[PDB]
Ligand binder design. Structure first.
Ligand SMILES: CCCCCC/C=C\CCCCCCCC(=O)OC[C@H](COP(=O)(O)OC[C@H](O)CO)OC(=O)CCCCCCC/C=C\CCCCCCCC
Ligand SMILES: CCCCCC/C=C\CCCCCCCC(=O)OC[C@H](COP(=O)(O)OC[C@H](O)CO)OC(=O)CCCCCCC/C=C\CCCCCCCC
Ligand SMILES: CCCCCC/C=C\CCCCCCCC(=O)OC[C@H](COP(=O)(O)OC[C@H](O)CO)OC(=O)CCCCCCC/C=C\CCCCCCCC
Ligand SMILES: CCCCCC/C=C\CCCCCCCC(=O)OC[C@H](COP(=O)(O)OC[C@H](O)CO)OC(=O)CCCCCCC/C=C\CCCCCCCC
Ligand SMILES: CCCCCC/C=C\CCCCCCCC(=O)OC[C@H](COP(=O)(O)OC[C@H](O)CO)OC(=O)CCCCCCC/C=C\CCCCCCCC
Ligand SMILES: CCCCCC/C=C\CCCCCCCC(=O)OC[C@H](COP(=O)(O)OC[C@H](O)CO)OC(=O)CCCCCCC/C=C\CCCCCCCC
Ligand SMILES: CCCCCC/C=C\CCCCCCCC(=O)OC[C@H](COP(=O)(O)OC[C@H](O)CO)OC(=O)CCCCCCC/C=C\CCCCCCCC
Ligand SMILES: CCCCCC/C=C\CCCCCCCC(=O)OC[C@H](COP(=O)(O)OC[C@H](O)CO)OC(=O)CCCCCCC/C=C\CCCCCCCC
Ligand SMILES: CCCCCC/C=C\CCCCCCCC(=O)OC[C@H](COP(=O)(O)OC[C@H](O)CO)OC(=O)CCCCCCC/C=C\CCCCCCCC
Ligand SMILES: CCCCCC/C=C\CCCCCCCC(=O)OC[C@H](COP(=O)(O)OC[C@H](O)CO)OC(=O)CCCCCCC/C=C\CCCCCCCC
Ligand SMILES: CCCCCC/C=C\CCCCCCCC(=O)OC[C@H](COP(=O)(O)OC[C@H](O)CO)OC(=O)CCCCCCC/C=C\CCCCCCCC
Ligand SMILES: CCCCCC/C=C\CCCCCCCC(=O)OC[C@H](COP(=O)(O)OC[C@H](O)CO)OC(=O)CCCCCCC/C=C\CCCCCCCC
Lengths: 68, 68, 68, 68, 68, 68, 68, 68, 68, 68, 68, 68, 68, 68, 68
């Protein structure tokens, strides 16, 4: 009919999230951490969490390859 | 007629989930944990759950063999 | 129907927060740090946190680009 | 008799939800998140969920196209 | 029979919440933050959350338009 | 039946909190700050928080009008 | 026989719930929120929910008229 | 048969909770706040919550009348 | 069956806590404040909190009567 | 035959639950709250719930009479 | 057949929990509070909760008798 | 089947924690307090907490006996 | 035919669960609590639940005898 | 058919978790505590929880034997 | 299918965190402690925590081996 590879679809999701959409998300994540420092009180834990989340999320393909 | 081994079919499901489809799923799992840290607050429990789920899911054949 | 790019929407959020709205937020952040010194006791840590938050929040696009 | 394309009807639902009705829903979603911050306590997770839901819901056509 | 536009109804909800009812809610929000400072201890985070919630809730139409 | 304007009710809450009940609350707030200085150690931050909370809470209508 | 307007009956339910019975319910709602603060810990969210529920429930006729 | 006014029953609940039973509850609430200061550390927020809960709970009839 | 007044039970709790059990608790509270000064550093705030808690807890009946 | 009053049977259930069986249940309820404080962390809400449940359960006859 | 008093069974549970089993539990509760001070930081609240839980749990019969 | 006394098991836990395992824990507790003084700043409160925790934890049987 | 005592079968289940199979289950329960502390955050409640479950499960015969 | 001892399977799980897989888990637990100190602030409680979890998890067989 | 050893995967995580990724993390940890001294006030406790975290995190394999 009009089907496609399930592997292709999940790969499309990986492609979309790690494309320009992910770059815009990364910008908003840095915006959020900036505001949290701004109208709250600065902390090393919060910047570590946000930056670490960005590193983990964009490294998902390579982190998955290392996990095999 | 046109039948096949039920054991072969269940083995095909094991083959498919642990093939490229599982690798793409593993990438999306790391994407999800990255975003959860990103727009939430980082926690060791959540990364342990996601990474442990990936380890369990790809180790299913070997974990099953150990269970005999 | 009436949809649009998800990437465009997240880019619109980046545009809005870093536009005149962010400038007004930056003013209020400097207001808050001024009052904290004013009716409290001055400290280098608090001004560093507020100013650093402003630098991080407006530098989000460029900080994200450096993170790639 | 008086039938029509099932594809047209489902496309009409996509058109209606993403039209002015969706814009009004988007306004009420931002109203709800504003009140939740207002009479509760502000959190980055809740604004991320509401804004992300709006992005996902209006991006449904394009997200579906990427999924093919 | 006696129906009406669903878009009109959702627009009526937007009109009602952002009308005099929202102004009275905004007053009570400032009352709540005043009492929290009053019988608790003052903090910049709590006033930022309450004021930000008011800004978000009344800006819902314009924030939604920017999200398109 | 026996309903009334929701706007009237929220306005009644604004009227009640800012009436004689608020004046009595304001007295107790000054009592609390006096005792905190009394059996603790005097500080400018605590009096600023309590007095600022009273100013914010009674100025809620006018602060809300300025926020429009 | 001995029938009546279904519209009258539903209007009677609206009349009864919004009459003295609703006033007594409103008193018990304020009793419940008082006890929750009393033998628990005070929170702005819980008073907002209870008071908002009272406002919504007595404003049902007018809220319904606005929805048309 | 042996029925009675539902309004009377809800009024009976209001009468019972605000009678001698409520006075005994008020005593236990002051006992609880005293012990919390006693074997913990004193705070203005906790006494405000307990005392405010007592004021709200006994003022339920009058608070409800003001809400109309 | 074998029931009793709920008011009597709550009054029994008031009687028990304010009886010899409360006197023994008062002794342990003074023990705790003595040790805190002993193996820590003396402060007027801590003795005020403990002594104030004892005064509040034993004065609960009379404090409740004043609140009416 | 060998029937009896349904009212007598329901009254027998009221008699049994409020007799020595209820006293033993009351002891176990205080045991449960003691252990919850013991191997958990003490809270005023939990003791209020357990003690309030005992007061409500033994006051059922009198609470029902007040409800008429 | 082989039944027994439900009151006896609930009394047996009261007997068992308050017997040597409860004494051993009391020892472990003091062990837990000792370790919490040991590998954490000492606090009066935690010892009050654990000791109070032991007092409440072993006093359940007498506390229940006072509640009648 | 293969059961045993619940009292014996809880007594076994008391035996194990207060045996050589507790002695090794006591050594590590003194190690921790030594390092806290070492790479921090010495304080009488911290040594009192750690030593008091050891005294409480090993005295659990005798402290429980005194509580009866 | 080939039947047996229903009492024997239920006793066989009691024998099997409390035999070597229960010992292996007890080991896995301690494994689970160790990992929960390990990749989460330690808490006294969770160890109390797991250890208490083991005590209850192996004490089932004796706990049942006490219940008669 | 192709069955095996349920006791053997649960023993296999005990063998697997306490084998090389557990050693690798122990390494990751020490990694996690190191990072928590690293990008957060050092605390004795967190290292006690992680190390205690490792001790409990690998001691599960012997801890279970002591519980009998 | 496409599975692998769960032990290998957990060992891969140990390999990845302790490889070049850990070296880069170690650099950022020293960066963070430098900035904390820089825009705050120097303290021996904070450098001890950060350096100790690095020592613990890279020593995880050897610390785990010592724990056996
Ligand atoms: C593309 C870069 C994205 C990061 C933006 C960096 C730019 C720029 C980052 C730094 C820009 C601001 C510099 C001044 C900030 C400051 O000094 O603020 C004073 C506040 C005072 O607050 P308070 O009174 O409450 O006391 C809290 C403290 O106890 C006492 O000080 O102290 C702090 O908060 C701690 C300092 C945090 C430093 C974070 C650096 C992170 C860099 C890098 C971190 C690397 C994260 C690694 C993540 C893991 C990756 C696997
Ligand atoms: C051949 C082995 C098959 C099993 C695979 C084991 C491999 C490997 C199993 C473990 C591999 C992952 C280790 C890290 C997992 C983790 O730490 O995740 C954090 C999440 C955080 O989530 P959240 O925020 O929602 O809070 C939920 C909790 O309250 C707070 O933590 O915590 C948990 O979920 C609890 C931990 C469950 C541990 C299960 C071990 C089962 C082993 C053995 C179980 C034996 C089962 C016995 C069955 C009965 C037999 C008769
Ligand atoms: C074509 C793409 C279609 C998917 C749309 C993705 C676009 C875009 C997807 C992401 C766009 C929104 C980003 C921000 C969302 C957010 O951060 O919200 C905060 C809320 C806060 O709520 P709360 O307080 O209740 O706490 C709940 C949590 O415990 C604490 O956070 O946290 C969450 O809900 C968890 C985050 C879910 C992330 C889902 C990503 C799925 C992507 C991909 C998933 C792949 C699915 C694979 C399916 C299987 C396939 C075989
Ligand atoms: C229509 C205006 C509505 C706001 C009312 C402003 C009027 C008036 C606002 C200010 C009126 C009071 C001035 C004095 C308050 C004070 O100095 O209190 C001392 C307390 C002492 O407490 P403690 O001992 O616990 O130590 C806590 C601190 O660490 C040490 O000080 O310090 C503080 O709390 C921090 C100061 C907060 C300042 C908030 C200003 C917000 C303005 C504007 C904020 C803009 C919010 C933007 C939201 C986002 C929008 C997108
Ligand atoms: C007829 C009026 C009915 C309401 C009764 C008002 C009377 C009277 C209402 C106020 C009477 C009590 C005043 C003192 C209460 C107090 O200060 O308590 C300290 C506790 C401390 O607890 P903790 O340690 O856990 O920390 C929790 C906080 O983070 C730190 O403080 O702080 C609070 O709980 C927050 C304060 C809530 C204020 C609610 C006002 C609602 C009014 C009006 C609300 C308007 C609701 C609008 C609903 C929506 C309508 C569309
Ligand atoms: C004619 C208007 C009819 C609606 C009545 C609105 C009037 C008035 C509506 C608002 C009047 C009450 C305002 C204060 C309510 C409040 O703040 O309560 C605190 C409780 C605290 O509870 P808790 O502790 O359990 O934590 C739960 C939350 O996680 C933490 O907060 O928080 C909430 O519940 C979330 C807030 C819900 C806001 C709903 C607004 C809906 C409006 C509009 C919705 C639009 C619906 C669109 C439907 C789809 C249409 C296609
Ligand atoms: C019938 C009266 C019932 C109240 C009992 C009053 C009797 C008597 C009330 C007062 C009797 C005790 C007086 C001395 C208490 C004391 O000084 O303790 C020192 C502790 C030290 O602790 P720490 O080291 O942790 O530092 C915490 C602080 O930051 C530093 O000090 O400081 C405090 O806790 C703050 C002081 C709270 C004062 C509360 C008064 C409430 C009155 C009235 C409140 C009105 C409540 C209004 C509710 C809303 C109504 C709508
Ligand atoms: C026959 C009497 C039955 C009750 C047993 C009373 C005996 C005796 C009752 C008291 C015996 C113990 C006294 C010391 C307990 C303690 O101080 O513990 C410290 C813990 C510390 O924990 P954490 O660190 O987590 O911080 C939690 C708090 O925020 C900070 O403290 O603080 C608490 O838990 C709050 C104190 C609760 C007090 C409950 C009294 C109830 C009495 C009476 C209640 C009346 C109930 C009315 C019910 C409704 C009736 C209609
Ligand atoms: C003849 C009277 C019959 C009623 C018995 C009242 C006697 C007496 C009723 C009250 C006697 C007990 C007083 C103390 C109870 C308590 O404070 O418990 C703490 C628990 C803690 O639990 P947790 O940790 O899980 O957190 C759950 C909450 O989120 C945090 O607190 O909090 C609660 O449960 C909420 C309080 C419920 C109050 C119900 C009052 C109903 C009265 C009246 C209700 C009117 C009902 C109207 C029905 C509709 C009629 C049309
Ligand atoms: C059979 C007895 C069982 C109890 C064991 C007592 C033996 C022995 C109990 C005492 C043995 C140790 C004595 C030295 C402890 C110490 O001084 O530690 C310093 C730490 C420093 O920590 P940090 O820096 O974090 O600052 C925290 C403080 O703010 C500053 O100090 O200060 C404390 O923690 C407060 C002191 C608590 C005292 C508790 C006594 C309870 C007795 C009796 C309590 C009675 C409980 C009543 C319960 C309710 C009953 C209804
Ligand atoms: C022959 C005796 C049979 C019973 C075995 C008792 C032996 C022994 C029974 C007790 C043995 C274990 C003691 C320690 C258990 C524990 O403390 O666990 C911590 C968990 C933590 O879990 P979490 O994080 O999810 O938070 C859940 C809670 O909110 C926070 O704590 O807390 C609990 O679960 C509540 C405690 C339940 C206590 C049940 C006692 C029942 C006795 C007697 C009950 C009587 C029953 C009456 C029935 C009605 C009769 C008419
Ligand atoms: C194979 C060994 C695994 C452990 C690694 C040990 C190696 C190495 C462990 C030690 C390596 C680092 C040494 C310097 C650390 C330091 O001094 O940091 C300063 C920070 C400053 O932070 P802040 O400003 O926030 O103030 C927090 C404090 O209040 C003030 O200081 O102080 C601390 O955090 C307390 C010190 C914790 C010491 C933990 C030792 C655990 C050992 C052994 C613990 C035994 C655990 C037993 C578990 C139970 C077993 C049944």
């Amino acid at each position: 009919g009009g089907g496609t590879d399930p592997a292709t679809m999940v790969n499309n999701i990986c492609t979309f999230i790690l494309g320009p959409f992910g770059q815009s998300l990364a910008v908003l994540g840095i915006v959020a951490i900036g505001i949290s420092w701004m109208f709250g009180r600065a902390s090393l834990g919060l910047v570590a969490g946000v930056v670490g989340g960005i590193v983990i999320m964009f490294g998902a393909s390579f982190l998955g390859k290392t996990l095999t």
